[PDB]
Amino acid sequence: TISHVIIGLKTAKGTKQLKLDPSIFESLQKERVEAGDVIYIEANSGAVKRQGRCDTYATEFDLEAEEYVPLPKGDVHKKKEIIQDVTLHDLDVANARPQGGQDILSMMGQLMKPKKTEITDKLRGEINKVVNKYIDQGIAELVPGVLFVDE
Amino acid sequence: TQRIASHSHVKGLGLDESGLAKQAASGLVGQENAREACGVIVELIKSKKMAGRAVLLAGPPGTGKTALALAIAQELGSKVPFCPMVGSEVYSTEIKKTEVLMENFRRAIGLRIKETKEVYEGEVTELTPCETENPMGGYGKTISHVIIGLKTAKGTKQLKLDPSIFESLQKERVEAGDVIYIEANSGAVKRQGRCDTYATEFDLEAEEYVPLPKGDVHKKKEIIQDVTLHDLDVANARPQGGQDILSMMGQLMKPKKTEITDKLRGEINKVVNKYIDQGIAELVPGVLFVDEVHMLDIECFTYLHRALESSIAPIVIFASNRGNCVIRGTEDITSPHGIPLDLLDRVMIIRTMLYTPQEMKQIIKIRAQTEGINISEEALNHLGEIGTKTTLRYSVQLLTPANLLAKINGKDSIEKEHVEEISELFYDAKSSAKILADQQDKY
Amino acid sequence: PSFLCVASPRVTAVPLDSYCNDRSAEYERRVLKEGGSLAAKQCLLNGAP
Amino acid sequence: CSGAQGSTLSFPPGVPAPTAVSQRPSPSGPPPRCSVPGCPHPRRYACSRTGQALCSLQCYRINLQMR
Amino acid sequence: DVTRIERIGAHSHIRGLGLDDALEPRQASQGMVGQLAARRAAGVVLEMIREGKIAGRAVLIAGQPGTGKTAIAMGMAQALGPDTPFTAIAGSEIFSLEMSKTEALTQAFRRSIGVRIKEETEIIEGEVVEIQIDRPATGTGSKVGKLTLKTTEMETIYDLGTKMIESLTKDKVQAGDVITIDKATGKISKLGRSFTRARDYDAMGSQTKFVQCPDGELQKRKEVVHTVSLHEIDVINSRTQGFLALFSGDTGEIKSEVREQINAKVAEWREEGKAEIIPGVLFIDEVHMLDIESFSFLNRALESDMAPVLIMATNRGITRIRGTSYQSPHGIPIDLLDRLLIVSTTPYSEKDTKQILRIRCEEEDVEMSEDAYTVLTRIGLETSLRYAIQLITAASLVCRKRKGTEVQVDDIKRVYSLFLDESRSTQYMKEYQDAFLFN
Amino acid sequence: DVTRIERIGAHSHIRGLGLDDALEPRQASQGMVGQLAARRAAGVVLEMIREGKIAGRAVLIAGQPGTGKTAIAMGMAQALGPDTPFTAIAGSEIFSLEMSKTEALTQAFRRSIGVRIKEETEIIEGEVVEIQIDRPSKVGKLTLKTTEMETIYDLGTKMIESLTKDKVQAGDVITIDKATGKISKLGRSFTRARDYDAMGSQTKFVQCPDGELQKRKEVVHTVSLHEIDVINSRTQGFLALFSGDTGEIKSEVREQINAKVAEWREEGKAEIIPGVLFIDEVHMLDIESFSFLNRALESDMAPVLIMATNRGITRIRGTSYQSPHGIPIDLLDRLLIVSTTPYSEKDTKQILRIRCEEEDVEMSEDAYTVLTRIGLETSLRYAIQLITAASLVCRKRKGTEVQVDDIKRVYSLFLDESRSTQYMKEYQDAFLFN
């Protein structure tokens, strides 16, 4: 039924076709995307955003509740090396409580207020054990920093 | 095995039936007049007559005033609730000090309430609705009853049931060769899973298979259930059945201790009387034991003035090691045993004495033969002298490290040399404090 | 008795709402005004799916 | 209904006789066993390359070595 | 053999004030004995409480430890009886971690004003003869049905409504059940099964003791008196479907706008005659536990027309008001002490002491000789009265353990050697003065 | 090169707590020096922990600052090893903002009792090769791969519904507990990691499994008694094991768990491994929290307690009174006390050599001489802080083996208390408050 979704892309610099994972197409449908929208796909992360309807369709009706954007002048496809900084505390927080799990698009995340909590000793034991596994696989490297205590 | 602790030998008060105390019996030795007093307290508790009448055991550290309060629990046995605390339990963050006392006053009273369980259970062999050949007027066909065939290891039986059951047997997703049960007191039906005889009709299937029930298709027993009044207090204050949003929200939210009203206590009292009058429920007025009572503050103590008087309350045992201390939560109010004079007025005091060298040696012997240890006479006659120079707990507590050292040195009983080697390695409170006074500038 | 429930708020305000000037953004507040999935909506409204 | 003669349930003509009766399956006496002739074990799974029923990696090698 | 939840405690022998109709104290009556001056005063304020016309009047009961301050407080609780609310608070109980002091006192006040409501309703109480429930083949869900009920005298048929049908079927109602239906509430209730129709039967649908068939006319009246405090009227109004908060106590610091509004609507239910208002008593036992913050709340709470009659008790001399430096009488600020009447209790004679011990032994089912009473009367003057009241049961139990029928003088000398008076324990605390901790 | 998440701390030169079979201490071994009597006593309690026969034992380790109290406790924790609980807390970790001092101690006790359980299983683990279903109920088959075999399952109806709810694909790696019937994805096999150009945020790549497809074994789990207490506290209690967001567990649960865990031990189904609770700097436990230990040392499944402390006769926290160690007398005779002693010059050399062996540093015997004098004229733990700085000054000096001139330089740069307080007096009114 759906092994993948082919999607076609265009910019003033050219075109590509991409083979999307069904989880990315589920995200296109989350954003209510249709052909003739201008889309940003972050293929290393699965982030998807509608920028607006492409202005070649800006005359489809004289007055309709969409914002139209010019066909992107940028490349269809862009690469960088990027280097991510994350602290062990960001792991200790983001894995301790059940996540919100709800990308705004929900409503249960309105009821239980987020609050700081006495994060257990044991979980830090497992974060240390997972980080050890990843720095051995070379996916991460470590920078022991400084804590500076004023007063 | 089970593992030994600081009271495991204490099996009872070891009295004669005249109420007098033996020199050494039921794992205790000495304290004769205080054991005789505890004998009257055991009779008092067994009588069920009284409410709120209470005792303080008072005496120096390591004299036995926790061992006697546990010996009372052994003389009562498992059937009556004995609820222990330190005074320091009351300082909860969730809930006020006096409510932690009031909840423990409600733990120390038990219902013993007996009821029948009856159930039908088995693998469902067939579901067979039975028609009447004459319908009622204007209708195509009519059912008088449903037959459910049920199987268990003891046999198979066709149960007959009213046709409303068939509606519920398609809310439950039942199919032939499921195992199911029906509550005979209630008419409710439930599915457990496919019966284990079918655990091979696919190489994988998404259910855990249930072994065939054993005994007859219809089961009956009596059970003598027991609940503290505090269990009734919490089960009424925070219900657990989930068929409403208040209960699901209240069960996804963090559980919290709450200041239960005197009204809930009142209504539970009014209804347990309704059943005790009918002989449905037995009642066991139990014991509340507080150790380290001097850790309660004057607000706790000034609540115990009401609680020890109240006509519902359990019999209460207090213990303290204190002299004329200042009462916690007051600046400079010195009072005997660290307890306010107007609470100390409301309790009987049992004086607990120091042991003589011979009694300490007799305790150490009773410890060794229950800690799993063999001791030479030249070791025991040294260890009772160490206890005389030091303290009971220290000289007792030297037994197991002396056994470890003796076993490491390849021998089956503690020798003199092993006791003094452990005494050289391990300091007591008195010998330790002298080093702190000598080396005063270096700590 | 069926008549002890007689207090009332003097004022009952609408829950506050964040207007935003973007076509993608206004679908998100619409989804929140509906209740953000039929699973989560049915879950509070009728108890479970 | 419920009455002095016990309960009854009733359907107008053309309502489905909706209590469809249910009756037991009648499986084989032996459960399915491993294909290797020296093996007493139950079938756990079957080989994808040859189709025989199997119980272990020992039997998977011992089968595929001789087809 | 039988033993109810309430048992023999420190005041269970007290059953009233023992006053005559001219409001004079009898020397020994209703369990009270001696103590004429304070019993007289308690009688006057009891009569003022039964009158109920006047709001926020207050009393402080004072005198030595162990001289019947709490005895007289329980005496008037029993003389006032169960139909009028009496709330006992030990002064420590207001120091909540869930709510502030002024809330805990406002709750203790409003728990002590009763609103009394007669609920009169029409009930049908009958034995089910037969039921028909009709259900559509699919449809919109317009269910319909008929039900029939009997008594030993009369029977009839009811054509059923839509909400009745779900309330009936929710409780698995069936022929042979005995049920009691409230016509105004729309609620069923089940009394059991009748012995008859339960024979035309299956593998079990229920297991309970049967009940006799209902008698007289099938439709009959019921009457209930509710006694609902202002506090639980405020709690029910604090949040919709809040009814469990009455038990759990979890509703903290209720909105002032609720109390302001309930004070009006409770007055309207009096002017409509729809509900009685029955102002009761708040007994703040050991009131010297309240902070000066809490006494300053009482100064201005105790002047509301919804205030209950407030009774303090305390045993303290000139001592500093809790939470401050200042010394004052009874541990109370004169800001408050100026506002309330003081009832003064007195120490006891031989006659009073022996008579208190005798009425206590009566309630505890104990026989003692007049010689044993003579030594226990001596003990109750050589030592505080509560210690003598604590030897009685011990002496009865030692007597029972040696199989005596009556407590003798040497049973009390035995028990006196066995359980210490404070004055004797605090003496032995001088030989072991090196061994007890923190003198 | 590759720096692990753990690196050289203050204690990490120890590798255990060196003793012979007679519990006789070696002068220098397993990264410890001297302290002969205290190490015998630590050995005797270590064998008492291994035997486990008796509950609620307590040792107080006491003596001057820098004399190795935590060095015994961490060395003992390594000599005991893993596979037996060792909860270590500084005393001030118990003053929670959500639960009493009673609770934080109760949880610290209960977290130090290990229950071992045997559990019997068969679990499938493999790369799903394809899935086939058809409509006549439903029928289907699916193929699993592991590096050793490709194999097929003729799965049932509820399984077909469950896989079609998990939406599994060819090239996923999946696991199913055969007894329980529950599916669980692990990720996508590395060979599949290119047939999409953009990939879902929750995707992860894993190797194809190996060995037999449906491994059949019993296994041993160790789980501490506190976790059973938390799991039973509320409907989803295990989330609180990680979230920390739990406290004031109802005593009715804890005493039910005693009865059940004792019952499993009599039924032979589980075995109880007594651990240790170590309270470093116990002296600052409040009087209420000390009084709680007077009952928790008596429960017939208490851990052993090891308490380190560093104090003379001192005011007990939360009171006016003064006592040995800052500990109440009614606890001190339930404790058994082990006392350290200050180091000689001859011992102080060996510990500095052991730190330099651990840091991988080389020094002249002149530099060890001067540093030993510095570590004797001022506290040991200051000389242990000069060696790293002497190494880094040596690197900046373009050296390789450190020298007395490097020690004298670092000693001029980083002050101890005795010199720093001496200089503070010469400018005192420029500092704030006294």
Place this chain on the structure above:
Amino acid sequence: LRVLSPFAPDYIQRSLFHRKGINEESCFSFLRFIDISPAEMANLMLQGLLARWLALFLSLKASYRLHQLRSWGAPEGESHQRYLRNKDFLLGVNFPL
């Protein structure tokens, strides 16, 4: 922060069944004694308060089925005084109330 999570079903399986030591303590050991599988536990940590609610609603269904099994038979120890079973840490059904 979600890939380095110990709640990943890979790390749960590798923690739970692929250990080196004959005895070796590891997290998620309790999941053998509650009715929760690795992916259900990961999903309960990462799908948030909706998955909390469904896993609660199923747990009530499981409670009545557990109570019957827990209260009407006593077949000693599962292989002669050995081996615990699925759900054996759920003791919230043993209270009479």
